[PDB]
Design a protein around this ligand. Structure first.
Ligand SMILES: CCCCCCCCCCCCCCCCCC(=O)OC[C@H](CO[C@@H]1O[C@H](CO[C@H]2O[C@H](CO)[C@H](O)[C@H](O)[C@H]2O)[C@H](O)[C@H](O)[C@H]1O)OC(=O)CCCCCCCCCCCCCCCCC
Ligand code: CLA
Ligand code: CLA
Ligand code: CLA
Ligand code: CLA
Ligand SMILES: CC(C)=CCC/C(C)=C/CC/C(C)=C/CC/C(C)=C/CC/C(C)=C/CC/C(C)=C/CC/C(C)=C\CC/C(C)=C/CC/C(C)=C/CC1=CC(=O)C(C)=C(C)C1=O
Ligand SMILES: CCCCCCCCCCCCCCCCCC(=O)OC[C@H](CO[C@@H]1O[C@H](CO)[C@H](O)[C@H](O)[C@H]1O)OC(=O)CCCCCCCCCCCCCCCCC
Ligand SMILES: CCCCCCCCCCCCCCCCCC(=O)OC[C@H](CO[C@@H]1O[C@H](CO)[C@H](O)[C@H](O)[C@H]1O)OC(=O)CCCCCCCCCCCCCCCCC
Ligand SMILES: CCCCCCCCCCCCCCCCCC(=O)OC[C@H](CO[C@@H]1O[C@H](CO)[C@H](O)[C@H](O)[C@H]1O)OC(=O)CCCCCCCCCCCCCCCCC
Ligand SMILES: CCCCCCCCCCCCCCCC(=O)OC[C@H](COP(=O)(O)OC[C@@H](O)CO)OC(=O)CCCCCCCCCCCCCCC
Ligand SMILES: CC1=C(\C=C/C(C)=C/C=C\C(C)=C\C=C/C=C(C)\C=C\C=C(C)\C=C\C2=C(C)CCCC2(C)C)C(C)(C)CCC1
Ligand SMILES: [Cl-]
Ligand SMILES: [Fe+3]
Lengths: 42, 66, 334, 78, 41, 31, 37, 341, 32, 52, 48, 35, 36, 39, 105, 33, 42
């Protein structure tokens, strides 16, 4: 009926996930949009 | 266009695109049923609002009682 | 060529990123010390005795106070409208207890928007255009003078002015309508017809432009990409948007002169906020709103309540409960 | 520019004031006798200033029932 | 300048009916509201 | 404990005010 | 499984970023005091 | 020829006022709502509803007169003239409070007829339908304060009454009983209306101030014909002025006028979302972090904590007079007074 | 001789038609 | 009478300040020349370098 | 309440599909007052 | 505490004498169309 | 000449607007609803 | 049979009878006066 | 300066705005050039006469009118000014700089 | 009932003067179309 | 010496900020990388 865990660690995991996850999705979408800008509509 | 065994048995359902009935069609048949449904919707609104209290219809919470 | 004219032609130069003109020699250092004291005293100010009754109010972010409760609290009422700078205090924290941060922000902010208003004149001189955007900014500057300076001038202390915070503005409005009846004042009545009316004409004129654009664009892309910036031709048919709105109401209820239309946009909210800023300042000297309490009487003389009495039962309930231990005598400032 | 008789060539016409230099008073007078012969109090339910209270009813009148409000408002005045 | 001497024009247009819906109640009610304030209690 | 959140949000929206003035998309004309 | 003709690219200029960075922050300025209660 | 195609030719004809197919819904329902307010503010009392004299017939002026809300005793009733409450009688139906549901139902069916009109003009003259979209703000205030707010509450009594001072109750009614001001949807609405009043003032008084010298007279209102191809004002100078005064400036006239559409409407739509939640008493009344603290510290005080005590002054003094059907017989010793007044 | 009592004799319209006395000093003295 | 004399002497000299802002603007714009609007043959912004 | 707006947007969009990019050059002569008997009908244009 | 009053009144007079001697230095010649 | 001027029909309709609004301010200081 | 029921059916007739007058009044007003070259 | 007719008006409107704001605060604060027997009592001295007329009344009921022990802990009738003067207590401590000819004796 | 025809009698006097000046010319309109 | 607030609301604000903030920086960088792919190196 309960498990006393560290309350800042929900921010350590989810910001520890979603800040570097969003860094790679920033870099991947612009890499394919540069391919789409160069191959198509050149 | 890929044609499969399921897309061949559903073929005459997605067939007659833009194959309408000419002129006015069944629009005076439709306007009777739209009027009767609106006439149905003013009845049950006034039954709920107790502006149409009818015999043996009690809109209290004590209707489903013992 | 002079040692001053080479400086005097830098201040009045339009080549800078922000215009730094001769009114900007006064509004840049006054607003930046009305910003640097506002940002610090919103985070880490100590609690402030606003009423002079030795009960401090804690309105900064350190002392609890989520930002729809925190405020730079007004000055002490024992101080009043006396000039209270830092050097007239015995110590800097004694200056913070009496609420010295509120006149240091609000005399620099009011002197900063008064020289923002001259700076809005000043770029309209060096760019060579008609200069009356200073007149349209004189409606917020007067309204920021009415709640911050003229209401402390008429009503005595600086504690009666508006607190620099979000929940302080809601406390300022309830205490105002307790004692001054701003809701039944016919100049605040005009201001909410220039606020609703100004919000109408923004949603009306902004609609009829964007509903009558000529298509210099494709279908899938955005519509705003069809107006090349700095073009010569108009991007919307004024004759079609007039012929729209001449069918909506009738033909002669709509301006097919777009200069008289756009002046009416600059006249309806600006005159309305001029009449609000008067009303709060005339209620600062206690020329209150309309008082139709107990007017309707029958033949026997018994009082019949009207709708101004149910406003008054609200107005009386926020009258007995504001300043709950700051009153010692039965009449409020009489 | 629509095809009908224009507005300001009606107001300035001499037949317009020959027809209702009287019926703008005759609606003003008909409005006057609606509120002075006691008809405005009667057909709209508004009480006269001596008909607010009643010798049998010193309190304020308020409706209590919903369906028998016709029976209540009859017994609330006189 | 001169009156419209001979050009035909309809008299009972819909702009006549649209005005008299908002004008004939107005001059009835003004005059009813004018008679309300000579009423002494 | 939670005043760190309000100071981060108020400074963090004061940087977007700073970046929209000086790092804006420059409206050049069209010749 | 042919190549699609109905695909189209998405644009977002720097003005639309600075409005969206202002909007998502100010709604977090507004609603943080009520979420924290 | 035809028969239905005939009536489309007459109703959509060009006249001084336009009827259209929306005019069969608008022009009766706008007439009996705008006229039904004006005949209950003039004659019809509120004495048997609220205990309030509010009409011009019994001694009120333009401010303190209203068609008041019907009763608590009726309770969500549609209150027809032929209905079970006030059967047949016109004088009882005015006395029960049935003119309020005569106006607010004709108003709710007139704003349908005006927004269908803005679809019908823009389709016929060939424009884009961005005026019926901008009118969906004013629809969503009338459908959520006058209809969806009292339907969630108790009755039609707690609705806004159509009058000038009767609205001024309803602003202070939602302050004391609801702490409406602290509601963040309403604070989204104040920055939508005062933002729209800014955008109407700051755009209207900069194109009267950066305009081209097109004429030769001293006044500039004569120097514009409607059908001119050239721009009547200078976009590049108005971009140059606000880039150095403010720091940001519009570069798109086409995006500028959409921002004058979006800022009032999406301010008016957001505060309409909150007052739907105010019908259920899902209000943003108190900060529970600061009510636990102010109960556990008798020297912790903020303007929020001062705003709660002002609400208990409003809800305890007005309650004997605002809701007289409840019979609140509060003595003078138990209502919260302050000190010395 | 006589001057300035119209729209296209001074430029100002009638609602500004009190400011046709700036370069007219005799009428302005009788205006004060 | 103090409450009329002080209230109306915000109503007059605030407005008398507004017409000063109207006329200090207009007199320096009429003496410079651009009181009827921007000259279309040479507007001064187009002969300036842009901001950035 | 929010779905009432998006229906009103989509009902605006499915009727006004051809003017979604903006109005054409055919608008200017069909709008000005008293030109046509029926509004938005170029077969009625009312002359002599 | 007096040293702040010496320091503020240095700063307030410095921007006021830039204001007064700035507008005295031929301000209506800082327009366009001549000089 | 068979014509009324346009400024004359707004003048005698303009006095009656001041005339009706003049009686509405007098009637707020007299009669019913004037606290007398 | 209930007086609250029969007042609703009488409202349907009185809703019909008064608001058949703009049904016929927008039909006499077109067959006597119509457009010149249209549908 | 600018030397024109619209200029010389604009210099005088800013000067008359300065005199009109000053003539308001004469009428709201001064009681010597605007005497109280003619214009009525001022904003401060109405608030100080109320503290005086209840300093009289409770002294006539036999209270020691100093050592009042007011409700917030401060002075109810008589109080101390921030500069150290004996002033009236209550809300009227903001109007402590009042010079009025019925209390200056 | 008897005071209703005191109110509507200036209205009946209004339409009687209106149908004196228009009844020649309102007959022209209904016979035209 | 303390202020008892709602502990999931740190996740409601910071994920309520950094998930739509990262959505706009995803869309902006690929929009300029498509411009850089089409204008330059075409
Ligand atoms: C992703 C969604 C959440 C998944 C969590 C979950 O998985 O959980 C979903 C369910 C939760 O199971 C419930 O689990 C309960 C037991 O948990 C509780 O009881 C335990 C003993 O007291 C501990 O105290 C524990 O902390 C406390 O939560 C009971 O046994 C219930 O019978 C049982 O239905 O998993 C199941 O049923 C089985 C399906 C998986
Ligand atoms: C044997 C026959 C039979 C019976 C006994 C019922 C029984 C019922 N039907 Mg029903 N029905 C039937 C046949 C039958 N049906 C048939 C054949 C059809 C045609 C397919 C329908 C179609 C139908 C519909 C469409 C609805 C019902 C509903 C109902 C319920 C009414 C009670 C209730 O809670 O309404 C309460 C609901 C109302 C009174 C509806 C009022 C809605 C108003 C008119 C409009 C409100 C929205 C509007 C946009 C206004 C917004 C403004 C806002 C601010 C207020 C009840 C269970 C209603 C239901 O299930 O709702 C729970 C309902 O909406 N029926
Ligand atoms: C000095 C004047 C001043 C300032 C800066 C503000 C600022 C604000 N008011 Mg406020 N207010 C004022 C005077 C002022 N008010 C007066 C005189 C009254 C009447 C008594 C009110 C009544 C009032 C109400 C009733 C409400 C506000 C609200 C607001 C907020 C949003 C405003 C909005 O949407 O409008 C439109 C805004 C713009 C067109 C431009 C944006 C301006 C930004 C938001 C100002 C930010 C100021 C802030 C301190 C940051 C400064 C940064 C600086 C330190 C670098 C904002 C914090 C609303 C609120 O609670 O939201 C929190 C609200 O409900 N105000
Ligand atoms: C009290 C303020 C005031 C004063 C002193 C003046 C004075 C003047 N205006 Mg003027 N004006 C005013 C208000 C005022 N106006 C307002 C409010 C408007 C806006 C509607 C105008 C619009 C305006 C225009 C359009 C013009 C003037 C002109 C003039 C000048 C000559 C008037 C003339 O020839 O008519 C002579 C007057 C009459 C024949 C009859 C007037 C009624 C008399 C004086 C009866 C009063 C007798 C009295 C009881 C004793 C004169 C100096 C004219 C100008 O510039 O100079 C030529 C001109 O064209 N004004
Ligand atoms: C001593 C004061 C003074 C003087 C001599 C002038 C002189 C002038 N002004 Mg100016 N002005 C002043 C004060 C003054 N102003 C103030 C205080 C303001 C701020 C409100 C303005 C704002 C202003 C504007 C905006 C404009 C002028 C213009 C002008 C010129 C023509 C005036 C005209 O035609 O108006 C004619 C008069 C009217 C149209 C009547 C206006 C009536 C107002 C709206 C109502 C007044 C309400 C009043 C308090 C109570 C009335 C009682 C009511 C029951 C009737 C003229 C040089 C014009 C200009 O630039 O010309 C070069 C112009 O466009 N003035
Ligand atoms: C330490 C600190 C900082 C303490 C302070 C704490 C504190 C007070 C915090 C609160 C701060 C805060 C931001 C509160 C906001 C409250 C809140 C909940 C906001 C929600 C946002 C909201 C309402 C969203 C809904 C959408 C909506 C209705 C938005 C309204 C938009 C708005 C408010 C303003 C935009 C209006 C505006 C400023 C327009 C200026 C336009 C302008 C000058 C353009 C430039 C320009 C003008 C021209 O005319 C021309 C011709 C050109 C060419 C040109 O370019
Ligand atoms: C008792 C009365 C109750 C109210 C009755 C009226 C209700 C409102 C009906 C009018 C609705 C007008 C819709 C206009 C939408 C904009 C489209 C436009 O551009 O204008 C209208 C235009 C006119 O079309 C024009 O005419 C040209 C030919 O003359 C071309 O067709 C062009 O398309 C166009 O330029 O287009 C349309 O007709 C769109 C038809 C959409 C119809 C939807 C179904 C009808 C509504 C049913 C409502 C039922 C209510 C009763 C229910 C009983 C139960
Ligand atoms: C709008 C219609 C208002 C008509 C009306 O009832 O005015 C009636 C009221 C006067 O109403 C009178 O009041 C008197 C009080 O002394 C009497 O006691 C009576 O109640 C009544 O005769 O007119 C006004 O108060 C001024 C009207 C201002 C209208 C501004 C409209 C702005 C929009
Ligand atoms: C007393 C009781 C109350 C009665 C009051 C009246 C109630 C009226 C309710 C129905 C309202 C119908 C509104 C129709 C709006 C669109 C009309 C229009 O402008 O279209 C006008 C255009 C005219 O375009 C036409 O196009 C045709 C080819 O498509 C032909 O070419 C025609 O020649 C051409 O003129 O379209 C129509 O013909 C009608 C389309 C819509 C038909 C009705 C929709 C369904 C309504 C059902 C109602 C049931 C109840
Ligand atoms: C001291 C001297 C004076 C300095 C004042 C500095 C103030 C600078 C303010 C800049 C705001 C920029 C906001 C980004 C927005 C932005 O930069 O957009 C940039 C945008 C550019 O428009 P364009 O003409 O480029 O449009 C073209 C494109 O839209 C085409 O798709 O400007 C606007 O849309 C109008 C700006 C309105 C005014 C901005 C809103 C004001 C409210 C600010 C919120 C305050 C919150 C405070 C919380 C603590
Ligand atoms: C409900 C009802 C009804 C009826 C309705 C109607 C028909 C109404 C009408 C109404 C009308 C038909 C009218 C009324 C009123 C009006 C008025 C009251 C007007 C006017 C006034 C005013 C407007 C004021 C003032 C002014 C002036 C004088 C001008 C200038 C401005 C001002 C504002 C100042 C029916 C049958 C359905 C049935 C049931 C009951
Ligand atoms: Cl006191
Ligand atoms: Fe526009």
């Amino acid at each position: 009926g309960g498990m006393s865990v560290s309350f800042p660690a929900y921010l350590a995991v989810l910001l520890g996930t979603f800040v570097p996850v969003a860094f790679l999705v920033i870099l991947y979408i612009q890499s394919e949009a540069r391919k789409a800008g160069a191959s198509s509509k050149s | 266009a890929l044609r499969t065994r399921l897309g061949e048995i559903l073929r005459p359902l997605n067939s007659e695109y833009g194959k309408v009935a000419p002129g006015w069609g069944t629009t005076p048949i439709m306007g009777v049923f739209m009027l009767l449904f609106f006439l149905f919707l003013l009845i049950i609104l006034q039954i709920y609002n107790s502006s149409l209290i009818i015999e043996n219809v009690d809109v209290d919470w004590t209707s489903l009682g013992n | 060529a002079s040692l001053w004219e080479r400086f005097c032609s830098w201040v009045t130069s339009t080549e800078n990123r922000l215009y730094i003109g001769w009114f900007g020699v006064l509004m840049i250092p006054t607003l930046l010390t009305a910003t640097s004291v506002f940002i610090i005293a919103f985070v880490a100010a100590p609690p402030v005795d606003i009423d002079g009754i030795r009960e401090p109010v804690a309105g900064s972010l350190l002392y609890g106070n989520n930002i729809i409760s925190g405020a730079v609290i007004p000055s002490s009422a024992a101080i009043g409208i006396h000039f209270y700078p830092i050097w007239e205090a015995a110590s800097l924290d004694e200056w913070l207890y009496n609420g010295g941060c509120y006149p240091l922000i609000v005399l620099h902010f009011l002197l900063g928007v008064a020289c923002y208003m001259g700076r809005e004149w000043e770029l309209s001189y060096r760019l060579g255009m008609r200069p009356w955007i200073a007149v349209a900014f004189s409606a917020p500057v007067a309204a920021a003078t009415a709640v911050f300076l003229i209401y402390p001038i008429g009503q005595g202390s600086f504690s009666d002015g508006m607190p620099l915070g979000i929940s302080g503005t809601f406390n300022f409005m309830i205490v105002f309508q307790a004692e001054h009846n701003i809701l039944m004042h016919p100049f605040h009545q005009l201001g909410v017809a220039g606020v609703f009316g100004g919000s109408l004409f923004s949603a009306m004129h902004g609609s009829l432009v964007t509903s009558s654009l000529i298509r210099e664009t494709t279908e899938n892309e955005s519509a705003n990409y069809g107006y090349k910036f700095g073009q010569e031709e108009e991007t919307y048919n004024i004759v079609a948007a007039h012929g729209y709105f001449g069918r909506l109401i009738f033909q002669y209820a709509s301006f097919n002169n777009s200069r008289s239309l756009h002046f009416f946009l600059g006249l309806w909210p600006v005159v309305g906020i001029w009449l609000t800023s008067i009303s709060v300042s005339t209620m600062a000297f206690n020329l209150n709103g309309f008082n139709f309490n107990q007017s309707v009487v029958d033949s026997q003389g018994r009082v019949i309540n009207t709708w101004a009495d149910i406003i008054n039962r609200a107005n009386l309930g926020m009258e007995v409960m504001h300043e709950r231990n700051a009153h010692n005598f039965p009449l409020d400032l009489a | 520019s629509t095809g009908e008789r224009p507005f300001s060539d009606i107001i300035t016409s001499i037949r317009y004031w020959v027809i209702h230099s009287i019926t703008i008073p005759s609606l003003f007078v008909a409005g006057w006798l609606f509120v002075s012969t006691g008809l405005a109090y009667d057909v709209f339910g508004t009480p006269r200033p001596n008909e607010y209270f009643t010798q049998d009813r010193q309190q304020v009148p308020l409706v209590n029932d919903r369906f028998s409000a016709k029976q209540e408002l009859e017994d609330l005045t006189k | 300048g001169n009156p419209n001497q001979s050009v035909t024009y309809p008299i009972f247009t819909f702009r006549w009916l649209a005005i008299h819906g908002i004008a004939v109640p107005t001059v009835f009610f003004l005059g009813a509201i004018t008679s309300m304030q000579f009423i002494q209690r | 404990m939670e005043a760190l959140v309000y100071v981060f949000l108020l400074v963090g929206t004061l940087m977007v005010i700073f970046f929209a003035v000086f790092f804006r998309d420059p409206p050049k004309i069209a010749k | 499984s042919n190549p699609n003709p109905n695909k189209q690219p998405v644009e977002l200029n720097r003005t639309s970023l600075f409005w969206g960075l202002l909007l998502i922050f100010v709604l977090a300025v507004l609603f943080s005091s009520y979420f924290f209660n | 020829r035809g028969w239905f195609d005939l009536i489309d030719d007459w109703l959509k004809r060009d006249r001084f006022v336009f009827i259209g197919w929306s005019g069969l819904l608008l022009l009766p329902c706008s007439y009996l709502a705008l006229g039904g307010w004006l005949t209950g503010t003039t004659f019809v009392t509120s004495w048997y509803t609220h205990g309030l004299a509010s009409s011009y017939l019994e001694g009120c002026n333009f401010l303190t007169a209203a068609v008041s809300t019907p009763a608590n005793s009726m309770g969500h009733s549609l209150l027809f003239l032929w209905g079970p409450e006030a059967q047949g009688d016109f004088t009882r139906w005015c006395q029960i409070g049935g003119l309020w549901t005569f106006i607010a139902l004709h108003g709710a069916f007139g704003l349908i007829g005006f927004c269908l009109r803005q679809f019908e003009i823009a389709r016929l003259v060939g424009l884009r339908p961005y005026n019926a979209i901008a009118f969906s703000g004013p629809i969503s205030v009338f459908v959520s304060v006058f209809l969806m707010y009292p339907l969630g509450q108790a009755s039609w009594f707690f609705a806004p009454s159509f009058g000038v001072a009767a609205i001024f109750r309803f602003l202070l009614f939602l302050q004391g009983f609801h702490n409406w001001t602290l509601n963040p949807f309403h604070m989204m609405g104040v920055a939508g209306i005062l933002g729209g009043a800014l955008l109407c003032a700051i755009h209207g008084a900069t194109v009267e101030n950066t305009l081209f010298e097109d004429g030769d007279a001293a006044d500039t209102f004569r120097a514009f014909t409607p059908t001119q191809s050239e721009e009547t004002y200078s976009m590049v100078t108005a971009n140059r002025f606000w880039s150095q005064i403010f720091g940001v400036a519009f570069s798109n006239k086409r995006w500028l006028h959409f921002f004058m559409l979006f800022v009032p409407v999406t301010g008016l739509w957001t505060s309409s979302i909150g007052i739907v939640g105010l019908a259920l008493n899902l209000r943003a009344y108190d900060f529970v972090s600061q009510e636990l603290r102010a109960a556990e510290d008798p020297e912790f005080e903020t303007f929020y904590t001062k705003n709660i005590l002002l609400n208990e002054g409003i809800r305890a003094w007005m309650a004997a007079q605002d809701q007289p059907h409840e019979n609140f017989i509060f003595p003078e010793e138990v209502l919260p007074r302050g000190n010395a007044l | 001789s006589a001057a300035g009592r119209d729209i296209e004799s001074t430029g100002f319209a009638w609602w500004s038609g009190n400011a046709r006395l700036i370069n007219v000093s005799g009428k302005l003295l009788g205006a004060h | 009478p103090r409450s009329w004399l002080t209230s109306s002497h915000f109503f007059l000299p605030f407005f008398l300040f507004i017409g000063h802002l109207w006329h200090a603007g207009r007199a320096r714009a009429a003496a410079a020349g651009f009181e009827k609007g921007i000259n279309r043959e040479n507007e001064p912004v187009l002969f300036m370098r842009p901001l950035d | 309440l929010l779905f009432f707006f998006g229906h009103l947007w989509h009902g605006s969009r499915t009727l006004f599909r051809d003017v979604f990019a903006g109005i054409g050059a055919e608008v200017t002569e069909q709008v000005e007052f008293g030109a046509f008997a029926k509004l938005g009908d170029r077969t009625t244009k009312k002359q002599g | 505490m007096f040293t702040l009053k010496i320091f503020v009144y240095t700063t307030v007079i410095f921007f006021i004498s830039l204001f007064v001697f700035g507008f005295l230095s031929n301000d209506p010649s800082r327009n366009p169309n001549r000089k | 000449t068979g014509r009324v001027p346009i400024w004359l029909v707004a003048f005698v309709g303009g006095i009656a607007v001041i005339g009706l609004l003049g009686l509405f301010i007098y009637g707020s200081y007299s009669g019913v609803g004037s606290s007398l | 049979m209930t007086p609250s029921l029969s007042s609703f059916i009488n409202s349907l007739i009185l809703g019909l009878v008064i608001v058949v007058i703009p049904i016929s009044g927008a039909l006499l007003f077109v067959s006597q006066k119509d457009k010149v070259t249209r549908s | 300066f600018v030397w024109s007719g619209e200029a010389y008006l604009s210099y005088s409107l800013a000067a008359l705005a300065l005199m009109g704001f000053t003539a308001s605060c004469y009428a709201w604060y001064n009681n010597t050039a605007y005497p109280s027997e003619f214009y009525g009592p001022t904003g401060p001295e109405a608030s100080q006469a109320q503290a005086f007329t209840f300093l009289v009344r409770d002294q006539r009921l036999g209270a020691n009118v100093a050592s009042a022990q007011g409700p917030t802990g401060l002075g109810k009738y008589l109080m101390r000014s921030p500069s150290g003067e004996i002033i009236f207590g209550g809300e009227t401590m903001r109007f402590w700089d009042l010079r009025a000819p019925w209390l200056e004796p | 009932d008897t005071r209703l025809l005191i109110v509507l009698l200036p209205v009946l006097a209004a339409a009687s003067w209106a149908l004196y000046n228009i009844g020649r010319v309102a007959l022209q309109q209904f016979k035209r179309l």
